[PDB]
């Protein structure tokens, strides 16, 4: 998970962001932005964070957009 901690900076912050994303893919209806490849929501969220698709600011922005709509 070195790439993920490099992209986030703090391991605890990475855990929190990945937990939010995994809950979005599991409890919510949100779809993955990367090929699932028969992976659990936690690993999918970690891969998305590594690819740079998911950050805390991105999650907050999407939540704000959903609230606006």
């Amino acid at each position: 998970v070195q790439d993920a901690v490099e992209k986030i900076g703090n391991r605890f912050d990475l855990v929190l962001v990945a937990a939010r994303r995994a809950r979005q893919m599991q409890s919510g209806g949100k779809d993955a932005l990367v090929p699932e490849e028969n992976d659990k929501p936690t690993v999918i969220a970690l891969r998305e964070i590594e690819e740079g698709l998911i950050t805390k600011d991105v999650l907050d922005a999407r939540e704000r957009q959903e609230q606006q709509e």
């Binding site: 998970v1 070195q2 993920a4 703090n10 605890f12």
Partner: protein
């Protein structure tokens, strides 16, 4: 929901408010119907129904009548769990003193009333009267009257005065006190007092009085009139098999109280003689004391089992109490346990988990997936399928555990590497398969060890397991930063065997295109593993700046070294492999892979190393045999010579030339020298062999003896153990410690006789007993450290302080004990590192010192630097990242929210089991002590200067003659005072002798202001001071061990920090334990947390008051902002136990130890716990304010701010 926990005294009205009824009878249940009796200890009218939504009548027996009270019975129709929450009360016929506020020394009632405890008990025990209302009489409040005197003065004065006896008298005395008036009186008397003893007494009493005034508590609440009654379901009376009943002792205690209360009421109704009533009141007091705290007043009340009854204090306190048994640790679900075997095929992140064990652990997940995919219609169908063990259930189990991490634990968990997360691989069997490379982290070997397994349920726990606790993340030791997954035993042996060199092996001198052709030659039996060949090697080097340079060249090596190069990741030199690889060499390989390539490459490299080592250890055929123990032929000759010379020394003893002690000493020296010579001869014979080379000559080769290979590689064995196998066992010790003159002149190959074996057992038993006892000692020390340091969390990034500590190489003689690079690796610079003799800023402030900057420091010959330290951090709560530095387990700067105190405590505590003038360099001489500086400018010899060939600055050439481990650590961390401490100069000034007063002597000192300070010295003191000398402050007057408190008082924080760190590190380095000094500094910071106020100023602080330093600092900042006189303080050094007991939170202090004292003090004070540390949030079930929960708590601190 709640933000704090508030403690204080309980008023009778509060106890009545808690209560749902009054317990009037000692009845519990009917003996036939087994139903609760009315107004008893188990009444359903008071505590609630025995069945859900029913009444004892049976009339209202459904949810349709919820909340309706039956008129026939009175039982409310509700749930049964209310019997765990509803309390009751007993209206006591006479007041009873509370045992905690009476006998928990110091007595709060005695302190408040300024009367000795003995007098209070005399009044309570109905032995002496006391005046409550003196009236118009010479009598004073609180003055004791005997019955004779009371009768006399009752005739004399009559109804003018009131005198009482018992708890009612104490209640009347406490109720009539005017607290503000007393506070004013003590303040006035403290203004005009000089004696320090009376000052201490009045300051303690004034603290108690003003605490009572501020808290809103009333003193008479320390005497009970209404007694609360615990819910019945917390003191259950439950049926066992066969009609037997199990009960709690609290029922017996409560029944005793109720019976004695009812008898008191009946005696008062009958107008009994006063002696009987006094007896009954004594018995009521005794019963209530037994119910609250059994054994404190006197003989503990025992039940029919002849053992003391367990009271409420025993409920809440101790190792087996609620705090430690059920709150700080718990039994958990989704957990299992099994024996551990070895999986040599696994990867570092994998663990072999049994199928049945996984089926039981992951059962709800299997139910969910069976329901989701339509294989089971309901959850009961899924339960049936799982119980029948169908194949589709196994496929579902695989899909469930596909990427679900699981936590493995081994007791004792001495450090955080005792719990790690792995990806489970389902295996047939009943034993857990554990990766070899993690065993050292777990201290786990496969001789019967058992491990526990836990399943993280929620997504956050799974991601914490994957990100923080996964074995691939934890490959560095948090105590030292060294790798913890270093290969051991067979792996090392294999890597040792494949990389050794043999003379005239098959295929010598061959030219090979690369590692692949070396492997091909090995597999075709063309060349041996130990054949010296020339191989074309392509080597890539990754420089510090990231430059990747590839060079191909032909290198002289062996076949095995190239075959091993085949698995080495790109970016490393071939010199790391072109040698025989012991444990140290493989450690260096892994360390360089981590430092130059990263984490993923290191994990893959470690796995490949372990695979290759196992394979070639198997292929080696290394075996132990009786011919491998080669006993040298010189052993017998040496034994004969030693025996003959011992006979000569005995003859000299019989001639009176030497005394008995001399004979003993020289015989011992003779045998020790013989043992050394025999060991040397054996090692020389075993280490070498003669071989025929290609030219036909004889050449010396290092031996391939199996025992020699095992010892030399570092796989297992040392020089001493081979000594015992093939040389001499040597001199042994008696149980007291003395050495037996005749040694064991036999090894384990030859075999000992009966006497030799008995002597050996003498020491074997001592070793085993020492291990067994030191385990408990180390455990207690670790618990104390964890308690004292549990609140230290990295709360900020930079605290903006300019303070720091001075760091220099450790010199304890003519050699460096440890380099400045090892001390500075991972610390943030506090003052700019100017080049010596120059003003260029080589290293600026606030830069982390890594390996590159360490090399920079080493090259430019820098001696002393200044770095930020946790002790000098200015953070209000916790520490900041820069003052801490690198996180040793992660390699980078520490993150916010890292619980560094727990890490420090575990790092110190884990190795506790292992715990028990001629110049030699060229340079100049500098005097301060004696220092010998090299030409480069580094200080390399530090020597004492007792009160010389070369003067100051004179160059000296080499050779010129200028002229108890664990107890010690525990005593250092407890700030213990030595038995005969060194007397240090209190003040700087001129010494002067004094009047030798009988008993012990006095001395005086004249200060710069001319004031005379008198010091008191014992007679037997080799004073080092001379009159007319201006001794500086902190100078030693009488030699001896130095008290840390004196060091703090006379030298400062830095001196005491250096002293404690140096002593602890000396103890640990004697045994070869590597622990960073920042952990010890964290513990010392938690030791320096209190200050005694010397100048009151205008802040709300009294002189001579021990208060928290952070509070004083905040108050001083506020007062400076208000431009007012700040407080003046002297910092105090407390032991870890005392510091733990004197924390702000009473939950943590109660959970540590001395629960009764902590709770009594908190209750009288009216303390409030803000739940700021880890233990409080663990106890209340909330997220800890560290790591993943840290941010959460921060958010709350914002919302409270807004």
């Amino acid at each position: 929901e709640f933000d704090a926990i508030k403690i204080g005294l309980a008023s009778p009205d509060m106890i009545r408010s808690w209560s749902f009824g009054e317990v009037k009878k000692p009845e519990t249940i009917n003996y036939r119907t087994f139903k609760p009796e009315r107004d008893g200890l188990f009444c359903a009218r008071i505590f609630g129904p025995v069945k859900d939504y029913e009444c004892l009548c049976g009339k209202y027996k459904r949810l349709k009548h919820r909340g309706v009270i039956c008129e026939k019975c009175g039982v409310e129709v509700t749930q049964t769990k209310v019997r765990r929450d509803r309390m009751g009360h007993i209206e006591l016929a006479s007041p009873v003193a509370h045992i905690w506020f009476l006998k928990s020394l110091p007595s709060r009632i005695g302190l408040l009333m300024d009367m000795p405890l003995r007098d209070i008990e005399r009044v309570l025990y109905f032995e002496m009267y006391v005046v409550t209302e003196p009236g118009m009489t010479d009598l004073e409040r609180g003055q004791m009257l005997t019955e004779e005197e009371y009768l006399d003065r009752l005739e004399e004065w009559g109804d003018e005065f009131t005198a009482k006896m018992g708890a009612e008298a104490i209640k009347d005395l406490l109720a009539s006190m005017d607290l503000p008036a007393e506070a004013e009186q003590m303040r006035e008397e403290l203004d005009t007092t000089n004696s320090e003893t009376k000052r201490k007494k009045l300051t303690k009493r004034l603290k108690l009085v003003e605490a009572f005034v501020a808290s809103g508590n009333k003193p008479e609440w320390m005497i009970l009139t209404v007694l609360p009654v615990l819910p019945p379901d917390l003191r259950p009376l439950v049926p066992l098999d066969g009609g037997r009943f199990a009960t709690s002792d609290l029922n017996d205690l409560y029944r005793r109280v109720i019976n004695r209360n009812n008898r008191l009421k009946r005696l008062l109704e009958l107008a009994a003689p006063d002696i009987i009533v006094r007896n009954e009141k004594r018995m009521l007091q005794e019963s209530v004391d037994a119910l609250l705290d059994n054994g404190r007043r006197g003989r503990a009340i025992t039940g029919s089992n002849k053992r003391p009854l367990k009271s409420l204090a025993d409920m809440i306190k101790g190792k087996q109490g609620r705090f430690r048994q059920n709150l700080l640790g718990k039994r958990v679900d989704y957990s299992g346990r099994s024996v551990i075997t070895v999986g040599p095929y696994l990867r570092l992140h994998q663990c072999g988990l049994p199928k049945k064990m996984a089926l039981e652990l992951f059962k709800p997940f299997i139910y969910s997936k069976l329901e989701t995919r339509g294989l089971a219609t309901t959850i009961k169908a899924a339960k049936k399928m799982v119980e029948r063990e169908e194949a589709v259930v196994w496929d579902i189990l695989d899909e469930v555990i596909r990427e679900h991490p699981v936590l493995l634990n081994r007791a004792p968990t001495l450090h955080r590497l005792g719990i790690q997360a792995f990806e489970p691989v389902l295996i047939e069997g009943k034993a857990i398969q554990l990766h070899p490379l993690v065993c050292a982290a777990y201290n786990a070997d496969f001789d019967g060890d058992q491990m526990a397994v836990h399943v993280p349920l929620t997504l956050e726990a799974q991601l914490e397991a994957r990100t923080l606790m996964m074995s691939t993340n934890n490959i560095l030791s948090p105590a030292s930063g060294d790798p913890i997954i270093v290969p051991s035993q067979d792996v090392v042996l294999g890597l040792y065997y494949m990389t050794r060199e043999k003379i005239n092996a098959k295929g010598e001198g061959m030219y090979l295109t690369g590692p692949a052709e070396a492997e091909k030659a090995y597999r075709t039996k063309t060349a041996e593993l130990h054949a010296r060949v020339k191989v074309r090697i392509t080597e890539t080097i990754k420089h510090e700046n990231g430059k990747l340079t590839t060079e191909t060249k032909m290198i002289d090596t062996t076949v095995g070294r190239a075959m091993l190069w085949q698995i080495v990741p790109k970016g490393l030199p071939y010199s790391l492999v072109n040698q025989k690889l012991g444990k140290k060499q493989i450690s260096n390989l892994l360390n360089e892979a981590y430092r130059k390539l990263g984490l993923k490459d290191t994990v893959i490299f470690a796995d490949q190393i372990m695979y290759t080592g196992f394979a070639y250890a198997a292929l080696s055929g290394v075996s132990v045999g009786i011919d491998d123990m080669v006993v040298p032929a010189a052993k017998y000759t040496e034994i004969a010579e030693a025996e003959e010379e011992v006979r000569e020394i005995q003859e000299q003893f019989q001639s009176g030339l030497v005394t008995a002690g001399e004979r003993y000493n020289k015989v011992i020296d003779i045998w020790a020298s013989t043992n050394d010579r025999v060991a040397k001869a054996m090692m020389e014979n075993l280490s070498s062999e003669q071989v025929i080379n290609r030219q036909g000559e004889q050449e010396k080769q290092e031996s391939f003896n199996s025992i020699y290979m095992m010892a030399d590689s570092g796989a297992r064995g040392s020089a001493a153990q081979i000594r015992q196998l093939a040389g001499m066992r040597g001199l042994m010790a008696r149980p007291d410690g003395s050495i037996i003159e005749t040694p064991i002149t036999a090894n384990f190959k030859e075999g000992l006789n009966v006497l030799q074996y008995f002597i050996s057992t003498h020491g074997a038993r001592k070793g085993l007993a020492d291990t067994a006892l030191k385990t408990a000692n180390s455990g207690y020390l670790t618990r104390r450290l964890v308690d004292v340091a549990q609140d230290v969390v990295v709360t900020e990034h930079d605290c903006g302080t300019l303070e720091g500590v001075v760091m220099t190489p450790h010199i304890e003689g003519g050699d460096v004990k440890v380099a400045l690079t090892e001390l500075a690796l991972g610390r943030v610079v506090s003052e700019d590192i100017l080049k010596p003799g120059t003003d260029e800023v080589l290293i600026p402030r606030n830069t982390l010192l890594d390996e590159k900057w360490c090399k920079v420091i080493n090259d430019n010959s820098v001696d002393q630097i200044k770095v930020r330290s946790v002790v000098t951090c200015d953070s209000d709560f916790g520490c900041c990242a820069q003052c801490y530095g690198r996180d040793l387990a992660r390699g980078h700067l520490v993150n916010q929210g890292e619980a560094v105190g727990v890490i420090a405590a575990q790092s110190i505590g884990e190795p506790g089991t292992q715990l028990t003038i001629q110049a030699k360099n060229n340079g100049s001489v500098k005097l301060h002590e004696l220092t010998i500086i090299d030409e480069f400018g580094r200080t390399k010899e530090k020597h004492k200067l007792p009160y010389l060939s070369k003067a100051d600055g004179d160059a000296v050439a080499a050779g010129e003659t200028v002229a108890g481990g664990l107890p010690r650590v525990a005593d250092l961390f407890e700030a213990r005072k030595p038995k005969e401490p060194a007397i240090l100069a209190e003040h700087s000034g001129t010494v002067s002798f004094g009047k030798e007063t009988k008993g012990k002597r006095r001395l005086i000192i004249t200060r710069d202001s001319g004031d005379t300070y008198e010091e008191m010295i014992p007679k037997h003191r080799q004073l080092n001071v001379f009159e007319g000398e201006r001794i500086e402050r902190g100078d030693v007057i009488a030699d001896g061990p130095e008290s840390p408190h004196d060091i703090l008082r006379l030298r400062g924080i830095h001196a005491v920090t250096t002293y404690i760190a140096n002593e602890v590190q000396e103890v640990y380095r004697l045994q070869g334990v590597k622990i960073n000094d920042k952990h010890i500094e964290t513990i010392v910071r938690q030791m320096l947390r209190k200050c005694t106020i010397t100048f009151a100023g205008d802040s709300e602080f009294l002189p001579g008051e021990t208060v928290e330093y952070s509070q004083v600092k905040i108050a001083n900042r506020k007062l400076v902002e208000e431009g007012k006189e700040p407080a003046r303080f002297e910092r105090e050094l407390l032991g870890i136990t005392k510091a733990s007991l004197a924390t702000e939170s009473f939950i943590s202090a109660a959970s540590f130890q001395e629960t009764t004292r902590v709770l009594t003090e908190a209750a009288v004070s009216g303390k409030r716990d803000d739940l700021r540390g880890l233990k409080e949030n663990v106890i209340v079930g909330r997220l800890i304010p560290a790591g993943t929960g840290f941010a959460y708590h921060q958010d709350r601190q914002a919302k409270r701010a807004q």
